[PDB]
Design a protein around this ligand. Structure first.
Ligand SMILES: Cc1cc2nc3c(=O)[nH]c(=O)nc-3n(C[C@H](O)[C@H](O)[C@H](O)COP(=O)(O)OP(=O)(O)OC[C@H]3O[C@@H](n4cnc5c(N)ncnc54)[C@H](O)[C@@H]3O)c2cc1C
Ligand SMILES: Cc1cc2nc3c(=O)[nH]c(=O)nc-3n(C[C@H](O)[C@H](O)[C@H](O)COP(=O)(O)OP(=O)(O)OC[C@H]3O[C@@H](n4cnc5c(N)ncnc54)[C@H](O)[C@@H]3O)c2cc1C
Ligand SMILES: O=C(O)c1cc(CCc2ccc(Cl)cc2)c[nH]1
Ligand SMILES: O=C(O)c1cc(CCc2ccc(Cl)cc2)c[nH]1
Lengths: 340, 340
């Protein structure tokens, strides 16, 4: 069985791992291959802090709340594990700030010790009069990518640096199943009017005193386009940028100033923190995640395509549930191709 | 007016600063000097993680509770200022675990977002049946001492290496007022068998993924004699040793093993953490703090002693309230000798 996963970001590597662990049997000899244009240090997955937190407003698709919850429960059970440190996995508590009273989120019982902020706590944030506190998890993109790659490497998965021009090219070069995990660049392989680059920029800062996440929200600004402070393992993530339709890979001075002004006003201690570096990424923006099997009529016999893209700002928060569902879609192919 | 502060730990340095802040302008030649046999990294203060948390057993002492509350307010005021980094001061959330049910502490309204631990959080600690969760403060001993030193230095306070033999030694060179902040060694200057060493030992570990303090409690081991994990700015503190009457300043291997095994059982990710260092410190154990005035006769010149010692395990937690009460006692000397 020949399988080609296109892309080496969070989605591709986890779908490749999930499929390989659930379907690579002696009864199912899988030849899995990873095809990517950009790898482990230079993807949009690396730019992500890795904080587990779904949308403030409920999605149009209810399968997504299940996939996000399923990712949390999985990560939590491995949070005290001997491998936690390599994945970049750890528990964290923090603040959710608002200007108005908001209903409690769907994930209020998934996270640990959810409650509303007390007045004396709210008194610490002059600009916000309402908010939450809970304990979540972090899965840093870069460390997790480094973990997945190495775990795949010891499983025979061969990685290849190349820009894939079309599905047919991969199919004709002997592919049976094409797992499409191209993120925002899925439009280059197949026209998707529901796809747009959710451009984001961040800063990496040396602020070790920071033990909590601090996320502010504003409907005027929109989702992920308002200041956020996310402490990592070696550095703190300074964010708050979202530009729908922007394809500029370079960092810009206005977004730098926006992030810095916003986070230093949120936490004045930050004014003394050292800028380690800055990065730019593209959230694969869609009304909902595209996670389905598509038949491609390549002459007589058809080559199968599993699309797994359009994860927006929640690709780490949801990855595992999407991986298991894509694995479920991979199982249906095996049985429909007389192999189960 | 000649003042000699004996002690360069949290007690001496904070007391020197308070007497200066309140009295530099009333007395024409206010002369303050600091005498100490150990400084900056070599004091008991330096051995302390600096978590704000009163003694496990309720006093029931309103005055002692006011000294603790006064310190929290004074530190919570600095916590968001762009100077906080220099004090070694930051907010930190965490767990306090017990095998059995217990009443809420009198400080439940001093700390931020105090609550009982949920059943899903208790599942993370199989050895414990009940516990608390709250947000408090860390004021790192070494870092704080450096800030107090630089505040004192700018105010022209001078530092001298001197192992004082008697109060009479210092009264003879011209001291009008001696401030006794000798911690656990106070008995050498004036007999006090109530003051005993509470031998403690800690491990300094590199685990920057740790964002929560974890403290365990066992009445059969006694206070401070149960595993505790307190993340600092650049390093994590591992401890849990209390040895009443032990004067050994050497790091013990059995205590090293007991600290390591005890903390790795509580938090298994700690197994991969790299041990940076270890220290031993003697808590100035006394059933109650010795904070009072005492007149000396030596010389035709009057010589007054202000005692401020015996803060056990909670020196950083209580210091500010004690430093202000010692400044007020200094003020009582001026309104008695007719100099204010
Ligand atoms: C600033 C910022 C901060 C964020 N923080 C968080 C967070 O804290 N938590 C969270 O849950 N999510 C966060 N996100 C969202 C998250 O980063 C994404 O949702 C997720 O990484 C995208 O996964 P991917 O694997 O689809 O995309 P990518 O990581 O972009 O990887 C796509 C892969 O497809 C390959 N590819 C594309 N086209 C081709 C082609 N023709 N041929 C070969 N290979 C191709 C690429 O080269 C690449 O290896 C953040 C995003 C941004 C922008
Ligand atoms: C392992 C451990 C962990 C701890 N963690 C915390 C914590 O998280 N939070 C908290 O609130 N507390 C903590 N503590 C408690 C805290 O360290 C003390 O209660 C506080 O340090 C004592 O202050 P001091 O100024 O009385 O002691 P010291 O720092 O010991 O200073 C005494 C000073 O007197 C000088 N001196 C003594 N005798 C003479 C003499 N004859 N001549 C000259 N100078 C003299 C010394 O050299 C020294 O400079 C901890 C203690 C230990 C041991
Ligand atoms: O910048 C992003 O794309 C991003 C950040 C996060 C974690 C912080 C956060 C802020 C806001 C909201 Cl609504 C949810 C989560 C996830 N994606
Ligand atoms: O060992 C000490 O003396 C010590 C530890 C701490 C911080 C953790 C802690 C443990 C136990 C209690 Cl009761 C309160 C606080 C301060 N001093």
């Amino acid at each position: 069985m020949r399988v080609v996963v296109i892309g080496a970001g969070v989605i591709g590597l986890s779908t490749a791992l999930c499929i390989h662990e659930r379907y690579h049997s002696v009864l199912q000899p899988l030849d899995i291959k990873v095809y990517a244009d950009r790898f482990t240090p230079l993807t949009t997955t690396d730019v992500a802090a890795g904080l587990w937190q779904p949308y403030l407003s409920d999605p149009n698709n209810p399968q997504e709340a299940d996939w996000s919850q399923q990712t949390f429960d999985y990560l939590l059970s491995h949070v005290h594990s001997p491998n936690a440190e390599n994945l970049g996995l750890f528990l964290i508590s923090g603040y959710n700030l608002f200007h108005e009273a908001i209903p409690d989120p769907s994930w209020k019982d998934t996270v640990l010790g959810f409650r509303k902020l007390t007045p004396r706590e709210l008194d610490m944030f002059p600009d916000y009069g309402y908010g939450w506190f809970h304990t979540s998890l972090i899965l840093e993109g870069k460390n997790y990518l480094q973990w997945l790659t190495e775990r795949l490497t010891e499983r025979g998965v061969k990685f290849f640096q190349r820009k894939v021009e079309s599905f047919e090219e991969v199919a004709r070069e002997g592919a049976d199943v094409i797992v499409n995990c191209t993120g925002v660049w899925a439009g280059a392989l197949q026209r998707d009017p529901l796809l747009q680059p959710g451009r984001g920029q961040i800063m990496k800062v040396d602020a070790p005193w920071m033990k909590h996440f601090i996320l502010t929200h504003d409907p005027e600004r929109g989702i992920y386009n308002s200041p956020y402070i996310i402490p990592g393992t070696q550095t703190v993530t300074l964010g708050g940028i979202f530009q729908l339709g922007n394809w500029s890979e370079l960092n810009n001075i206005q977004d730098h100033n926006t992030i810095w002004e916003g986070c230093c006003r949120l936490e004045p201690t930050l004014k003394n923190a050292r800028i380690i570096g800055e990065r730019t990424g593209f959230r694969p923006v869609r009304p909902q995640i595209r996670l389905e099997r598509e038949q491609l009529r390549t002459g007589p016999s058809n080559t199968e395509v599993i699309h797994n893209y359009g994860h927006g700002g929640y690709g780490l928060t949801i990855h595992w549930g999407c991986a298991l569902e894509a694995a479920k879609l991979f199982g249906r192919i095996l049985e429909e191709k007389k192999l189960s």
